[PDB]
């Protein structure tokens, strides 16, 4: 390069940031997903459709572990997701090299969004087009956080991103409640995934990862086919 | 017109117009003529004056004991390439203890002027270098361009109305090999006098002559020792 | 074919345009206009 370093994102005359608003439009056209925190662990569920019968399903993964107790999914564009995964993989290690202790789930979201917010203000790059959902049962009580391309972050009992995310928002408000179990949370997570999916729902149409206090765990397609009895 | 701004932008016809504009800057300077015999190389320049009280802007400048150059165009690009020119001559004088041959020094200039003709935010060097000197195999007359296409010529002229200067050369280029210095020089300044209006020629204030020779270091004369050369001339016919 | 341009003349067109516009009015015989044109160097004939 040369040293141009000028930010391509400036304020509107109305007083808004236009490119961040356009990046959220690419998030809303992403694949639908949902995440539910119910009183002993967190359940994450995504909606993985192969566009043809020729694709392999055991190659590309959506529910992705970060530590042995921290998982992470997304709703947005594919290739930009794999950047900040590898960033967050390394960033969890410098906590562990210094403190010799597994990193809390609130501590990544401080640091991952700080990577992501500074990346918008920096020069000559677009923002990301990926929102995240981060889970983990650190110190008994589990956690469920949601970041966005605007750099912000929140803390949800249960939420949904992707397509028809406002329809599943009204669905989770009525169906879910204060407390549940882990097994009840998976039942309603498929019920809001069946709200917007296609016709057939098999072990390859969806992919589910969970947290316990025993640790983060990703479900194999056997038990997902086994939990597919009494569907939605 | 919108593709005629930067050096980087090619044309849809395939001609980078920034170089073509820099060729016009060479044509604004005063004319000068260089030529060579078998054993000598003489370049003659023409000066201009900004006003009557102002002195005339000098053209020929000494570089090394055999290499001396003429100039046309800008004056910043003149001294910027001149400081690079004097630097390279004394380096091989310091390293190899020998003078540079004239040919491969000019190849360093085309490499030097290449980079600001390709990268962004850099103008080409508007300059009109005529180069004379000895290597071990005789005299040489070189000319350059802002497009960095150096030419091993035998007699050229660059600057304002050099169109008429070139025409005199080919009808006397056969004579430019056997004649010695006294008529070799005054062959050359017969070519400058058609680059002029028809009422002034050379009146010991606007002409300079540099000669490099076999037993002769590159010597510049100006307006007082030029007067022995300016005698023995016929006037312009009409 | 011909690209004729119209400039602000020098110092003497202004004196002459003075003699065009201030011929035709009723003035005193003590005119002078080199004094007037040197006071307005950059001006159009409309400004005259």
């Amino acid at each position: 390069e040369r040293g141009y370093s000028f930010s391509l994102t400036t304020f509107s005359p109305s007083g808004k940031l236009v490119q961040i608003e356009y990046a959220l439009a690419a998030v809303a056209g992403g694949a639908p997903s949902v995440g539910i925190k119910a009183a002993n662990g967190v359940v994450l569920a995504t909606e993985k459709k192969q566009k043809s019968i020729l694709y392999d399903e055991r190659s590309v993964h959506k529910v992705e572990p970060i530590t042995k107790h921290i998982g992470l999914v997304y709703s947005g564009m594919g290739p930009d997701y794999r950047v900040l995964v590898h960033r967050a993989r390394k960033l969890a290690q410098q906590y562990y090299l210094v403190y010799q202790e597994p990193i809390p789930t609130a501590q990544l979201v401080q640091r991952v969004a700080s990577v992501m917010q500074e990346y918008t203000q920096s020069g000559g790059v677009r923002p990301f087009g990926v929102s995240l959902l981060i889970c983990g049962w650190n110190e008994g009580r589990p956690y469920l956080f949601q970041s966005d391309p605007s750099g912000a972050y929140f803390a949800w009992k249960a939420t949904a991103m992707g397509k028809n995310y406002v329809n599943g928002k009204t669905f989770l408000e009525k169906r879910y409640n204060e407390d549940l179990e882990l097994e009840d949370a998976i039942h309603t997570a498929i019920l809001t995934l069946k709200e917007s999916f296609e016709g057939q729902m098999t072990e390859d149409n969806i992919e589910v990862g969970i947290c316990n206090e025993a640790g983060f765990r990703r479900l194999t397609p056997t038990e997902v086919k086994d939990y597919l009895a009494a569907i939605a | 017109n919108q593709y005629d701004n930067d050096v980087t932008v090619w044309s849809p016809q395939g001609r980078i117009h920034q170089i073509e504009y820099a060729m016009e800057a060479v044509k604004q300077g005063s004319a000068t003529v260089g030529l060579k015999s078998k054993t000598h190389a003489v370049l003659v320049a023409l000066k201009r004056a900004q006003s009557e009280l102002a002195a005339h802007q000098k053209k020929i400048l000494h570089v090394d004991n055999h290499i001396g150059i003429s100039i046309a165009g800008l004056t910043a690009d003149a001294r910027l390439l001149c400081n690079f020119m004097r630097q390279e001559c004394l380096d091989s004088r310091f390293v190899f203890d020998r003078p540079l041959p004239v040919s491969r020094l000019v190849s360093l200039i085309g490499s030097k002027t290449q980079i600001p003709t390709q990268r962004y935010g850099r103008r080409p060097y508007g300059v009109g270098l005529l180069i004379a000197g000895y290597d071990d195999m005789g005299p040489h007359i070189f000319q350059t361009c802002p497009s960095a296409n150096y030419f091993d010529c035998r007699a050229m002229s660059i600057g304002a109305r050099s169109q008429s200067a070139r025409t005199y050369l080919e009808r006397h280029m056969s004579e430019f090999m056997e004649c010695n210095l006294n008529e070799l020089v005054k062959h050359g300044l017969r070519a400058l006098r058609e680059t002029l209006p028809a009422e002034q020629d050379l009146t010991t204030k606007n002409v300079s002559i540099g000669i490099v020779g076999k037993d002769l270091e590159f010597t510049i004369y100006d307006d007082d020792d030029v007067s022995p050369f300016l005698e023995g001339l016929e006037e312009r016919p009409q | 074919d011909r690209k004729i341009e119209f400039s602000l003349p020098d110092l003497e067109g202004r004196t002459h345009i003075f003699k065009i516009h201030a011929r035709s009015m009723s003035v005193e015989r003590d005119i002078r206009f080199e004094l007037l044109a040197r006071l307005c160097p950059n001006s159009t004939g409309a400004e005259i």
Partner: protein, 213 residues
């Protein structure tokens, strides 16, 4: 280990005349107990009116000579004139100080005419100090030549001795006698005595032989 210095020898003499300058040196280049060559003069014509002598470590003498020859040309293309004698001595002092913490091992004497046609001799040191003197002798045999010219040229320690100015011809036989006596006692003083004479008309050279032991 690798020691970067070695002594080579040589002896330089300069005399500031009234309208001239005489610079003399031997031609032996030795190292240790052996002779590399018998033809190695220390005279260097810088300009038409300035001759420098360089003794000491010979590898620094070849380097320091070529630095000065470049800066003479850099002066002329920048100022359209040549340097004076005192301007070269002022320039050389900054060059010798520029390697203060890794010095040259070179004794320098600059002789030549001033801008009034009088002899000027500038002596030096390996770090950069200098002064203008009437006569100096540098090199290996420097101690055997300074007190004799104090008696002859300086006219010191003599009662009722007049002060005649040194002529050109009297100065020639003074130079030819002191290198004969120096060659008897010094082992570094060689065979050929290159003598350069800087007048207001050019530089003349002259070579006188000595004993070959």
């Amino acid at each position: 280990r690798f020691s970067p210095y070695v002594f080579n020898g040589g002896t330089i003499l300069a005399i500031a005349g009234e309208d001239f300058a005489i610079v003399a040196s031997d031609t032996r280049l030795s190292e240790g107990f052996s002779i590399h060559t018998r033809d190695s003069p220390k005279c260097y014509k810088l300009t038409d009116k300035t001759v420098i002598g360089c003794s000491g470590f010979h590898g620094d003498c070849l380097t320091l000579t070529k630095i000065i020859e470049a800066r003479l040309k850099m002066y002329k293309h920048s100022n359209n004139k040549a340097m004076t004698t005192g301007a070269i001595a002022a320039m050389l002092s900054t060059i010798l100080y520029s390697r203060r913490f890794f010095p040259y091992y070179v004794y320098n004497i600059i002789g030549g005419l001033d801008e009034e046609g009088k002899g000027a001799v500038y002596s030096f040191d390996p770090v950069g100090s200098y002064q203008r003197d009437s006569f100096k002798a540098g090199g290996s045999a420097s101690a055997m030549l300074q007190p004799l010219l104090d008696n002859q040229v300086g006219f010191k320690n003599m009662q009722n001795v007049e002060h005649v100015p040194l002529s050109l011809d009297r100065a020639m036989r003074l130079v030819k006698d002191v290198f004969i006596s120096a060659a008897e006692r010094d082992v570094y003083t060689g065979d050929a005595l290159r003598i350069c004479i800087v007048t207001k008309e050019g530089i003349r050279e002259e070579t006188v032989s000595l004993r070959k032991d």
